[PDB]
């Protein structure tokens, strides 16, 4: 009896979404000049990891970034002079994610052990020691994003997200509703909402303070691997195993553009945006990175220097450069 | 060029590099294996034998040593049923041990499907599988009793003849050898019907309480590495 009512509600929502559409983004963006051809070449190459690099994150100051490797190591590098500031060994070798505090005083990591470990960088003794160990998830940790040095949001492979409290160690809020395991996370610019993407071709919008689900976006035909927010804060871009990228907007509750090509068959592992939102960078399985025009949805550039699958990719806070990390255990920086 | 403090930072980075080199030397000399099996075989007992000779933990590791060679074995713990996402972390392991309970034929097709799924995988190519036909003690009793027997689970039985290669020294009658070699030929068909030249399969006949289980793994890993090195030089 509830199946029919759910079907009726879904049909009503679909009709309401169809009604609000009058034109498309391609028609409106048809009469402006293109961006031309983009030439980016590597400036720095960072070496020192032993196995494939699973994640990375840039600091607030745009000079220090942290990388995580599956040999069981975290490394904190200096970007300008290529120096190594810290090298931290972990208790588990299967680390799938890592984040950096906005304050710059802590670091987080986690993996197949279902524990989120928080390390303190500013210690009276000249060493880095683990300060907290958050437990309570019943699956591997996929992503973690940090908040005001005392709160952290984590997504897990048991189809749940959690808002924690480092001081006490207890989790304050739990977000449920996904069917497949959650693979990525992006905080809103105003850190009042956040979107998540799961392995059932669906993304969801979450309110941090209330703890409830606001909207659900379904436009993909396979599991979603990466997701992020448009600088303005009113739209998001996602990446899926169907070799296509999609752009959604919160205000209209719809999908605006699809980025795909005929020759591309592999999957998409990471998605990023430019400081002005014009460009969209995406890492692919065929050892390549692609740079797309976000408005005209026309391929604009490409990247290389990687001999294996590209896993992580991130743009700096001021828009100066972009960092890439693949499964050959090398990190590259491009202007 | 550099100021008085830049040189100290450079020296600190060099020291970190030296420590990383030592860790690389230690990390290159161990072998990692992945253990797999259902909640029907004696995988826990096989682990217990080697280990004697946290509330929601995700993975368990056991270390052992054969002829001064270190082996690390990982098996997953509190994880969900779907495994198509975390199986990509193990694309650079020496081998995958796969334990199958061959006593019951009620759920043998599920084991065959699991083996086929593991064999054909985009990221699990060039990885060799060591097969453990465990609990081949209740199998003989099940065959001898006759209350339950392979008659309708698989329709191709009673039309199979034992190949002229078996070495059935331990046995009471020549009727369990045919059944166990039929099971072995079952899993061996999937491995022989797919991509070859990159990875192989190494079957065994084991019982859960056995004395020689680490030596078989030692021998199979020796064979795997030797074949890779003999194929990198066009000698094979």
């Amino acid at each position, epitope marked *: 009896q509830l199946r029919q009512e759910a079907e009726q509600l879904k049909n009503q929502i679909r009709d309401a979404r169809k009604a609000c559409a009058d034109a498309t983004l391609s028609q409106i963006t048809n009469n402006i000049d293109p961006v031309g051809r983009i030439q980016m070449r590597t400036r720095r190459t960072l070496r020192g990891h032993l196995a494939k690099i699973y994640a990375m994150h840039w600091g607030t100051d745009s*000079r*220090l970034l942290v990388s995580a490797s599956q040999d069981g190591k975290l490394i904190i590098w*200096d970007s300008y002079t290529t*120096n190594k*500031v810290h090298a931290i060994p972990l208790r588990s070798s299967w680390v799938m994610t890592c984040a950096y505090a906005p304050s710059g005083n802590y670091v987080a990591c986690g993996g197949l052990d279902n524990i989120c470990s928080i390390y303190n960088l500013k210690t*009276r*003794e*000249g*060493n880095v020691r683990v300060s907290r160990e958050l437990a309570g998830h019943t699956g591997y940790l996929s992503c973690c994003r940090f908040l005001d040095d005392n709160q952290i949001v984590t997504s897990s492979g048991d189809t749940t997200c959690a808002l924690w409290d480092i001081e006490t160690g207890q989790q304050t809020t739990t977000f449920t509703g996904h069917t497949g395991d959650v693979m990525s996370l992006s905080l809103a610019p105003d850190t009042r909402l956040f979107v998540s993407g799961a392995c059932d071709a669906s993304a969801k919008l979450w309110d941090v303070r209330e703890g409830m689900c606001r909207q659900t976006f379904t436009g993909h035909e396979s599991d979603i691997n990466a997701i992020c927010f448009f600088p303005n804060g009113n739209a998001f871009a996602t990446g899926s195993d169907d070799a296509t990228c999609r752009l959604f907007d919160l205000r209209a509750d719809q999908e605006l553009m699809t980025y795909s090509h005929d020759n591309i068959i592999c999957g998409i592992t990471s998605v990023s945006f430019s400081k002005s939102g014009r460009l969209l960078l995406a890492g692919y399985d065929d050892f390549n990175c692609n740079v797309w025009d976000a408005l005209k949805a026309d391929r604009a550039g490409v990247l290389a220097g990687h001999d294996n699958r590209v896993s992580c990719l991130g743009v700096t806070d001021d828009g100066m450069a972009v960092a890439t990390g693949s499964w050959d255990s090398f990190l590259k920086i491009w202007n | 060029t550099l*100021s*008085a*403090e*830049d040189k*100290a*930072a450079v*020296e*600190r980075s060099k*020291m970190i590099e030296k420590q990383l080199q030592k860790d690389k030397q230690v990390y290159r000399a161990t072998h990692r294996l992945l253990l797999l099996g259902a909640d029907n075989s004696g995988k826990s007992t096989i682990v217990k034998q080697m280990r004697i000779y946290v509330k929601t933990s995700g993975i368990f590791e056991t270390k052992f040593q054969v002829d001064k060679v270190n082996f690390h074995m990982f098996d997953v713990g509190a994880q969900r049923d779907e495994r198509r996402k975390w199986i990509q972390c193990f694309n650079d392991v020496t081998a995958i041990i796969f334990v199958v309970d061959s006593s019951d034929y009620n759920r043998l097709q599920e084991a065959l499907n699991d083996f086929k799924s593991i064999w054909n995988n985009r990221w699990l190519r060039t990885i060799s599988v060591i097969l453990f036909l465990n609990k081949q003690d209740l199998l003989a009793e099940k065959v001898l009793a006759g209350k339950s027997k392979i008659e309708d689970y698989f329709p191709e039985f009673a039309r199979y003849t034992t190949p002229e290669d078996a070495t059935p020294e331990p046995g009471e009658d020549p009727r369990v050898t045919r059944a166990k070699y039929f099971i072995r030929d079952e899993f061996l068909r999937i491995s022989t019907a797919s991509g070859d030249g990159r990875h192989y399969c190494y079957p065994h006949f084991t019982c859960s309480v056995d004395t020689e289980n680490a030596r078989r793994i030692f021998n199979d890993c020796r064979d795997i590495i030797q074949r890779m090195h003999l194929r990198q030089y066009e000698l094979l």
Partner: single-chain antibody, 233 residues
């Protein structure tokens, strides 16, 4: 964190002595160490520097061929061997730690010191404005330091340090790199400069600011301190 100094006493001219520095409470092997001496009624004077891993050693020009510095990492100890003690080597010696990487703060802990008595160049120079300042509680005070070279480097750092020594105590870090507050120093203190002239400002003077204030440079390895400025309440 603790550093304890052993050795000293009364020595005859032409003799020899050994001084020990024992560290407890922090990772001794990750820090570089310095010796800093102070005359009975004068300022401070940097003496010797030992790096981390014992890969670099620096000496002052006046003690180049007489003093030796060494480490014992497993036992967490620092050694200074002194030979042919003259009458100008009668000073109180302090053990200092410092760690160098991106964003660190060197010279952030000093020992208590030990006392030793003996019976009978193109380098940067720093000048303190005045040797005394009469002020009252509750008001604002300003101190000045000057240099003979532009302490600003090409990267963008300045390398100027402000230390304070209270009566009957040891120096403590106040300001590092001319615009950064120390770990637990009160917010009232401030620092500023322009490349050649530098100024330290105290906004709301209190009872505990009484002492001698020193500036110091770290652009080059020959380390000069200066004379300092005294404050009286």
């Amino acid at each position: 964190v603790q550093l304890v100094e052993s050795g000293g006493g009364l020595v005859q001219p032409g003799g020899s002595r050994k001084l020990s520095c024992s560290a407890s409470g922090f990772a001794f092997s990750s820090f570089g160490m310095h010796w800093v001496r102070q005359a009975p009624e004068k300022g401070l004077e940097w003496v010797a520097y030992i790096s981390s891993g014992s890969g670099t050693i620096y000496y002052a020009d006046t003690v180049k061929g007489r003093f030796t510095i060494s480490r014992d990492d497993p036992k967490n100890t620092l050694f200074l061997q002194m030979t042919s003690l003259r009458s100008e080597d009668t000073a109180m010696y302090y053990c200092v730690r410092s760690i160098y990487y991106y964003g660190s703060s060197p010279f952030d802990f000093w020992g208590q010191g030990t006392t030793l008595t003996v019976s009978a160049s193109a380098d940067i120079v720093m000048t303190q404005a005045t040797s005394s300042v009469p002020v009252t509680p509750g008001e604002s005070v300003s101190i000045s330091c000057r240099s003979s070279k532009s302490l600003l480097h090409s990267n963008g750092n300045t390398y100027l340090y402000w230390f304070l020594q209270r009566p009957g105590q040891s120096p403590q870090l106040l300001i590092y790199r001319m615009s950064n507050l120390a770990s637990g120093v009160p917010d009232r203190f401030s620092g500023s400069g322009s490349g050649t002239a530098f100024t330290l400002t105290i906004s709301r003077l209190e009872a505990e600011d009484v002492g001698v204030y020193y500036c110091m440079q770290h652009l080059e390895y020959p380390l000069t301190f200066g004379a300092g400025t005294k404050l009286e309440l």
